[PDB]
Structure 1
Amino acid sequence: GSKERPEISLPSDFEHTIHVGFDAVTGEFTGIPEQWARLLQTSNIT
């Protein structure tokens, strides 16, 4: 593994990321909801 700038070429790779929340979310921060991981001990329903 090496860390170089923009090498000469670059074949794409497998799948990629997706986006599902609500228009203007990835570019919008409000209130102070969970960090998307504290669920290991949050106020879940169960």
Structure 2
Amino acid sequence: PSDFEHTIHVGFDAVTGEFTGMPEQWARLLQTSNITKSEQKKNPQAVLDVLEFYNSKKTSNSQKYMSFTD
């Protein structure tokens, strides 16, 4: 598991109902959270979007400031 460095982009195989190139953490949170295969197949983007939001909600810090519109 060593030598050549590469980047892999996450994918979702609609026929097999499974994400591909999923980083270890994400794969772990997914099966333990009980997000079913059918739900994943139903809206894979949302599932990835929610995984993102989740693991980002560990970085940003509590210090909240005013938020404005566009």
Higher strand fraction: Structure 1 or Structure 2? 2
* RCO higher in structure (CA 8 A, sep ≥6): 2
Higher helix fraction: Structure 1 or Structure 2? 2
For Structure 1 versus Structure 2, the TM-score category normalised by the shorter chain is under 0.3
TM-score, normalising length: structure 1: 0.20
Structure number with greater Rg is: 1
TM-score, normalising length: structure 2: 0.17
